[PDB]
């Protein structure tokens, strides 16, 4: 989408493998404010928002907190306390044309600067003077949008760049976007400190004799003590016998 009409995608209820992003070599700009993308794999959020658009290279700097200019003021504005990541990569091979690609537009006039994450797509004739325009262009009456000139021979500063801004949102609701949270192999007949789906403990895991129901996960003895567990990957029930101990 054009920067003045930047698209927003809402990411919810899924696993976000951020490595695919921060291990990629396809991005020239990858700058996260207030967060380390590695630690995102250990965090959950209610929602994520990917704001996607296209600008020229010289304007990439304007996509950052506390920045001013055409794009920041009139097209896309980040909050001064922005928490999240900005990713940008050259798109000359895709968004440029030999005759010049003008499909991408930017807002050239606006009566005031945009508030953070504000989106303005109006095509109102801009009244640059004291005479009302009444939707008619002319002296002191200009169209608020102007097309980018994107040619493959343009300088890298003037070449197209695709930009995606990842913002994270926590509400009074369950966090449904979570990291990978990989697992490891399991060993039996040896004292292990184990952490199954939500529970943790220490003991020896042994082949069991019980018949858990298809929906049961954690066993329980009479005296409210964990007794057996269902392995999350393998549909096998493991008895937890606490490791041997005794007085000397």
């Amino acid at each position, epitope marked *: 989408a054009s920067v003045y009409a930047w698209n927003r995608k809402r990411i919810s209820n899924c696993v976000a493998d951020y490595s695919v992003l921060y291990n990629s070599a396809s991005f020239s700009t990858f700058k996260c404010y207030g967060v380390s993308p590695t630690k995102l794999n250990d965090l959950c959020f209610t929602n994520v928002y990917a704001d996607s658009f296209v600008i020229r290279g*010289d304007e990439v700097r304007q996509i950052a907190p506390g920045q*001013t*200019g055409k794009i920041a*003021d*009139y097209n896309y504005k980040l909050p001064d306390d922005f928490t999240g990541c900005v990713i940008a990569w050259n798109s000359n091979n895709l968004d440029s044309k030999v005759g*010049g690609n003008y499909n991408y537009l930017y807002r050239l*006039f*606006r*009566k*005031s*600067n945009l508030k953070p994450f504000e989106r303005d797509i109006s095509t109102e004739i*801009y*009244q*640059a*003077g*004291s005479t009302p325009c009444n939707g008619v262009e002319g*002296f*002191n009456c*200009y169209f608020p949008l102007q097309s980018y*000139g*994107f*040619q493959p*021979t*343009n*300088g890298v*500063g*003037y070449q197209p760049y695709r930009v995606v801004v990842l913002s994270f949102e926590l509400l009074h609701a369950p966090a449904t976007v979570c990291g990978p949270k990989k697992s490891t192999n399991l060993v039996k007949n040896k004292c292990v400190n184990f952490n199954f789906n939500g529970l943790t403990g220490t003991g020896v895991l042994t082949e069991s004799n019980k018949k858990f129901l298809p929906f049961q996960q954690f066993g329980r003895d009479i005296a409210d003590t964990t007794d057996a567990v269902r392995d999350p990957q393998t549909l096998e029930i493991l008895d937890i016998t606490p490791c041997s101990f005794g007085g000397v």
Partner: antibody, heavy 113, light 106 residues
């Protein structure tokens, strides 16, 4: 349509001066308005700009010393200059920016010496 | 981006076809404007976006060029065209060219 600037004068280095630019036919607060200067016998040098939304920008040679502002009720653009230097000597024009500037004033002359 | 305008001075006669060249240090698409300035007068906008003659400017002034080499063409020089001409990079840091002075050939 005319841009009428005033306030230029002879002033010592380190002095201060405010330039005014009274506009007619154009609303300063609704336009990109710039100051541009021309040293004696030299070319044009852009000085400062104020966006319709209120943002201001400055050439590196004047950053931290000049301030551009405007008065909506008076439809007037201003350039406040501090810590003036000899190389600031120039005719100063105010212009409406469509970077392509179509409306220019007659200019006011600043001499710093 | 550095704007190199050539030549500094050029001599022409009334009715000649004049070509002024403005060279950018790299491709600036069509983001270029041309100005005309006479001694003691404010500059006058002639062409914007490298190929859009400003309203009211006579048909003589012709602008063209793309990428890194741009030209201002005065198809038929008239007495009131002897002046200094400036190019300016658009959608950037308002960088100006050094200027070209068109003078009376003899």
């Amino acid at each position: 349509v005319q841009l009428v600037e005033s306030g230029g004068g002879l002033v010592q280095p380190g002095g201060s001066l405010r330039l005014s630019c009274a506009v007619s036919g154009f609303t300063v607060s609704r336009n990109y308005m710039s100051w541009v200067r021309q040293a004696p016998g030299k070319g044009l040098e852009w000085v400062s700009l104020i966006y319709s939304g209120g943002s201001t920008f400055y050439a590196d040679s004047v950053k931290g010393r000049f301030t551009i502002s405007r008065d909506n009720s008076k439809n007037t653009l201003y350039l406040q200059m501090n810590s003036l230097r000899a190389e600031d000597t120039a005719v100063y024009y105010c212009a409406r920016d469509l970077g392509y500037h179509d409306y220019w004033g007659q200019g006011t002359l600043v001499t710093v010496s | 981006i550095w704007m190199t305008q050539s030549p500094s001075s050029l001599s022409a006669s009334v009715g000649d076809r004049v070509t002024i060249t403005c060279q950018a240090s790299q491709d600036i698409n069509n983001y270029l404007n041309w100005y005309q300035q006479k001694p003691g007068k404010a500059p006058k906008l002639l062409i914007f976006d490298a190929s859009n003659l400003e309203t009211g400017v006579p048909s003589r002034f012709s602008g063209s060029g793309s990428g890194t080499d741009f030209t201002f063409t005065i198809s038929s020089l008239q007495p009131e065209d002897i002046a200094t001409y400036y190019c300016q990079q658009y959608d950037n840091l308002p960088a100006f060219g050094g200027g070209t002075k068109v003078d009376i050939k003899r």
